[model samples]
Target: SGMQLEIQVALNFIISYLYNKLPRRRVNIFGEELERLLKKKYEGHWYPEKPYKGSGFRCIHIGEKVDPVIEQASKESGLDIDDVRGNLPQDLSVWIDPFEVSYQIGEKGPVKVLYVDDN
Candidate 1:
C-alpha cells in the first residue's frame, strides 16, 4: 500500500509539473504517453492482474477545443511542438484521477469546478 501510494504521489506531481509547463490541450496525450513510458520503464509494476488489466493510465479531457489563432501560430512558429503548445491562458489547470487525467481553462468549463464519473 505504501509503495502504491508513493508511486501515485510521484506520478501526480510529475504530471502536474509538466501540465503547468506544457500545452493544456495536450495533457490527455501526455497521460497516455507517460503511462506507456512508465509501464515500459518499470515493468511488472503497473497492473499485473486481470479484470483490472494493465497500466491504469488513461487520458480523459484536454480542456476545450484548440483555438484557431493559437493553432495557426503554433504551426507557423517554427518552434518545436513542445514549445509552441505552451501558449495558453494562465488560468488553465489539470485534475488527476486514478486512471486518467483531465484539464480545464479558467471557469469556462464545469469540469474544473466539479467532475462526476457515473460510469
Candidate 2:
C-alpha cells in the first residue's frame, strides 16, 4: 500500500462506474485503448461524467450504449456504496452521553437561549 495508482478525475469516474457495474467486479480495466486515451488526456479538456445533468452545465459522452450504461452504474453503485457497511457497528452501540443531553432537550425546545439588547 506504500505506492499508489492514480488517474485524473475524468477517467477515474468512468472506470469506477463501469467496473462497479461490469461482471469484472472492480478489477483494473485499464487496457490498451483506455490507456491510450488517458495518455492523450481526452485530447484536451477533462470532464465530469454524469448520468445526471442540470439545465445548463456542459459535458461529453462516448459509447455504443451511453445512456443505459450510466443509468445502471449510477443506480447500482450508488445503492451499494451508500448502503450500511459491515464495519459499521450496531446502530446505537457507542454514542454521546444521552443522560447529559436528556437534561436539555425537552418537548419541542432548545431551552438554552441567549440574547443581547444592547445597542
Give the per-residue lDDT digits (tens) of candidate 2, residues 1-119.
Answer: 00012223333434543454444532243322343433343222322242123211212123221222223333443433222122121121110110111111223334331211122
For each candidate, how many residue pairs have backbone atoms clashing (under 3 Å)? 0, 0
lDDT of 1 at 3: 26
- For every candidate, C-alpha RMSD to the true structure in Å: 12.5, 18.1
Q: Could you give candidate 1's per-residue lDDT for residues 1-119 as a string of tens digits?
A: 31233234434543465565665666545444444443344444443233134322322222354323333333543334344334444444444333333455665755442332323
Runs in model 1 deviating more than 4 A are 1-7, 44-119
lDDT of each: 0.41, 0.27
Q: Quote the lDDT for 67 in model 2.
A: 26
Lowest lDDT block of 10, candidate 1 = 54-63
TM-score between candidate 2 and the true structure: 0.25
